[PDB]
Symmetry: D2
Subunit: 251 residues, 4 copies
């Protein structure tokens, strides 16, 4: 054999059967990887986590909770076993209060709202790396989820700003990760119908030279496993676009 | 006079090395009439603003203060007279606490420090536009100061993250500003010796400041096909006046690089 | 006080009064520039066209594929502006791509000899013109070429997109050379403007699917642009070029300035 | 076996330091069945490909030769057997004449020289795709080799122009390829000690060859967060295989950087 055989990976961000994190975890387990999972609030997740092909420890983690971050390493070590380390970490987390999304006016988002958004969606990437790098093996891999923010657009609003920030953060985490011989990258996915796309939240399939199925997250999850594997060992601080090639075509 | 008869708000003056100070000087030399906004040290800023070619009303603006922002348009209108609107708004403002800069470990900057830096350095760009667009004339221009953050670097640390946010915020302000027939652009400048450079960047670099900066300067001058002088703010001031003018009317949500062309060169 | 007062500037690419180069020339003259014009193939028609300009400028023949034209250009420009005088500005406003590499013609069916001719006229000629004219340019000078944002693929523009990609690369290298003379080099990436090349080169290769082909791009570009876009008005592009020809962007080189209403910074 | 049972054309082998050689090697290690193409000195090339892990047919291919291109697909099919198709195609080829490289002045390259360089190095990507697409399986992958040309630099000169053309060509190739259910992508690789590096690049650098190559070897390593080893083609080769695999099913017309992460860092 499996692409991720014998690799110990932490996956965050599972909230539904539809969550990009869930399909990441599923594909990872298929490829031999042994996992540890984190959730937020509805610990509802161990049931959805129960749908996975193999059992994995479900640790609670709130990226706004400095205590959670401080203990996360030790609570992971206790799950995978002492003297064992992580080869992979997946950041699949975002949030933006309704005020900075959709049809709400861009100028009407209070900074407290935005700050919370950027906190959970961008800064948390730096902090998860801080907590986990001390227990990661050389050759290891950190991966975050992203939506191409290099052009403005309707609806995405302040999440676009947060992702922009995340991209910048990613390049700095890479500076730090390199000291451990660990890589850091983002997978910039196209739209997938998840709890976040409908809850908070044609043209893409047209631009994509190979098309795009907004119903299927497997192609995104495969791309994530790719980065977590040993087959992209010269790529860091970077972004891989799993968007059907859409971002490379004007029309 | 490149800016004859334009009424323009210039924020960000703190010393006479401030990029905003040179934007102000040049704009006045080119016939503009200014409203200036300082933060915190108003008595000292007044003395500094008194040394510009012409007099200009100075108003107080803390971009973290929600009440300063609510009264800004009214205060400006009072300063430029009833009936008169702005044609230009220069945003030349930044901050990031020491923890988020220099040789202080990237992972050690607490989010309260980062958030504040991003509030002042990025979100406030949307804040200013929100407060001043109601009082802008069609054909107007909003300009902010950038430092190319598309690649990571030493020392700039979290301010790099805030600049990336700023570019994104700029593109959305463009959309909003478009409803007023107003443009919104950033000028990404190369390194310039300002108070920020001395107090925030150098002070965070500590014992590594001399080497780190000399290699910043040498490498920037070498990469720039037409060279680069950290002591001279005028070429950047000139570029901002270009965007304020009517000579770049089809450009918005964009970034103009006033950096000697260093970002177009690998070495 | 004209933006370009007392500047001597070479402008290529005028073929009609719809040419981007025509509006550039017109606006440059209105701002006090003394112009020298260069034209291709149909000199007589161009001569009558430049007669519509504010002032009568000298017109010199330049086929960018002709070595003899390039080798003798500086000498002829010098004769035009008077000896001892130098140019402050050079405008490259020149493009060509044969029919096989445009429109609905299959991308794979364009022969290399056709592509290479397009790359020669549209991209390499930027370096050729710089080579010839740099020795007759003053410091603080400015070389500007017209671009069309090729960073993503699109229908119809096909191989001209490749040529533009090559041009952006050439520009960054021309900057290095130009820097030795105190001269800046930049591209203006303009949005779609109704020119001869628009109708004949691009319109002709689109067959019947052109009218709306072009009419649907005039609306699409305008929708994306936060400040709008008028594809029948070249003035905002010509003003932008004159801005780079002036002293007001003295720290910008090897670079690309987008006069496209901001469309390229917006997704939908 | 990441490429178990895959049929892949690998062009560009000339010596056992060629990026193509290592691409082929690793592809064979992962169970791929290969067809190789070489140019000019084919008896010499066959002796190099003899050093690969397994036996692969060698086909002559000058990408400037119309007859070679017109027969390619048939010759491939003859090699892999009637009714079988390619799942992969590697374009690992480039050339630029001396006048267009090194310390020879940029302005002195005749167009005929640049054009030859662009034909072999950029146009040939489209012509290879044109010949091989009709015999590619869905789920297939075409990969070409890139060196990040987004900024200008010493020495690389017109090859940089050629690489910029390539990336543009790649984005159009993806459009055509997509009709066949095939991806097309470039791998931008950091510097690797190969024949072209020494004979063409080093060749045109004259007395400055050593210094530029020493700087490249160490400066690229410092910039790359994970380090860079200019003497190991393996990570680049692994990256190419990753694109030939089914593990990047949603990426096309794109560029993947196998460069140590250097292009994301300014210093
Ligand atoms: N759905 C898409 O189309 C799409 C496209 C591009 C990028 N992305 C990105 O992919 C990632 C995953 O989201 P998704 O698309 O799978 O839908 P989702 O609803 O499953 O994503 C939300 C996740 O964030 C977690 N989370 C929220 N606040 C948290 C906190 N304070 N601490 C810890 N975890 C917290 C949630 O519990 C949840 O599992 C995000 O970063 C998202 O923006 C999604
Ligand atoms: N110095 C350079 O090399 C350089 C290069 C590129 C971009 N910039 C940018 O240009 C702008 C101005 O910086 P500078 O170089 O002129 O140094 P500076 O110190 O002269 O100006 C920085 C400004 O931010 C203002 N400020 C800080 N907090 C504020 C608040 N809460 N409310 C209102 N104003 C506040 C300061 O008072 C000051 O006037 C910044 O955005 C900076 O990042 C500087
Ligand atoms: N019209 C648009 O939408 C648009 C948008 C962005 C950029 N551009 C660019 O602006 C420039 C001018 O194009 P235009 O839109 O003004 O149409 P145009 O037809 O008026 O200008 C084209 C010019 O190219 C010149 N030319 C062709 N072959 C030549 C040769 N061998 N030697 C010397 N000159 C030669 C022609 O003589 C002509 O004057 C080009 O570089 C073009 O790609 C056009
Ligand atoms: N060596 C590096 O540092 C580096 C870095 C990034 C990308 N690249 C790229 O990788 C690819 C291979 O280059 P390399 O570094 O392995 O050097 P190399 O000398 O080992 O390979 C160059 C190949 O081009 C082939 N070629 C030249 N003309 C041809 C023609 N007319 N028809 C068919 N093949 C022809 C040669 O025969 C040779 O095998 C190129 O696209 C190159 O630019 C090299
Ligand atoms: C029109 C914009 C296109 C929408 C595509 C998209 C859907 C869902 C996403 O996930 C989130 C979004 C907002 C907040 C938190 C999360 Cl996890 C996402 O990042 C992007
Ligand atoms: C090391 C590279 C340094 C780059 C040069 C530079 C100096 C000062 C700047 O201003 C600030 C910096 C940080 C916080 C607040 C301000 Cl105003 C700036 O944006 C860029
Ligand atoms: C589709 C987008 C249409 C916009 C456009 C129109 C005309 C142009 O001029 C040329 C184009 C092709 C060949 C030669 C010339 Cl001069 C151009 O560069 C761009
Ligand atoms: C500056 C040095 C950059 C590193 C580098 C070395 C060799 C390369 O291969 C070629 C280069 C020129 C002509 C033909 C070939 Cl194959 C290449 O693309 C990049």
């Amino acid at each position: 054999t499996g692409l991720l055989d014998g690799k110990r990976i932490l996956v965050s961000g599972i909230i539904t059967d539809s969550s990009i994190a869930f399909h990441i975890a599923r594909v990872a387990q298929e490829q031999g990887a042994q996992l540890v999972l984190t959730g937020f609030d509805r610990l509802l997740i161990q049931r959805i986590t129960d749908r996975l092909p193999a059992k994995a420890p479900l640790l609670e983690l709130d990226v706004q909770n400095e205590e959670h971050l401080a203990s996360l390493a030790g609570r992971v070590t206790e799950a995978i076993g002492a003297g064992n380390k992580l080869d992979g970490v997946v950041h699949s987390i975002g949030f933006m209060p309704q005020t900075g999304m959709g049809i709400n006016p861009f100028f009407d988002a209070p900074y407290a709202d935005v700050s919370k958004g950027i906190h959970i969606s961008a800064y948390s990437y730096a902090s998860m790396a801080k907590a986990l790098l001390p227990i990661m093996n050389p050759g290891g891999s950190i991966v975050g989820m992203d939506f191409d923010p290099s052009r403005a657009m309707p609806a995405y609003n302040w999440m676009t700003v947060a992702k922009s920030a995340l991209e910048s953060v990613n390049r700095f985490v890479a500076r730090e990760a390199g000291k451990y011989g660990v890589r850091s990258n983002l997978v910039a996915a196209g739209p997938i119908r998840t709890l976040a796309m409908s809850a908070i939240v044609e043209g893409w399939d047209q631009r994509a030279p190979i098309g795009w199925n907004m119903k299927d997250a497997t192609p995104v999850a495969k791309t994530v496993c790719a980065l977590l594997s040993d087959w992209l060992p010269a790529t860091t601080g970077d972004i891989i676009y799993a968007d059907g090639g859409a971002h490379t075509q004007l029309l």
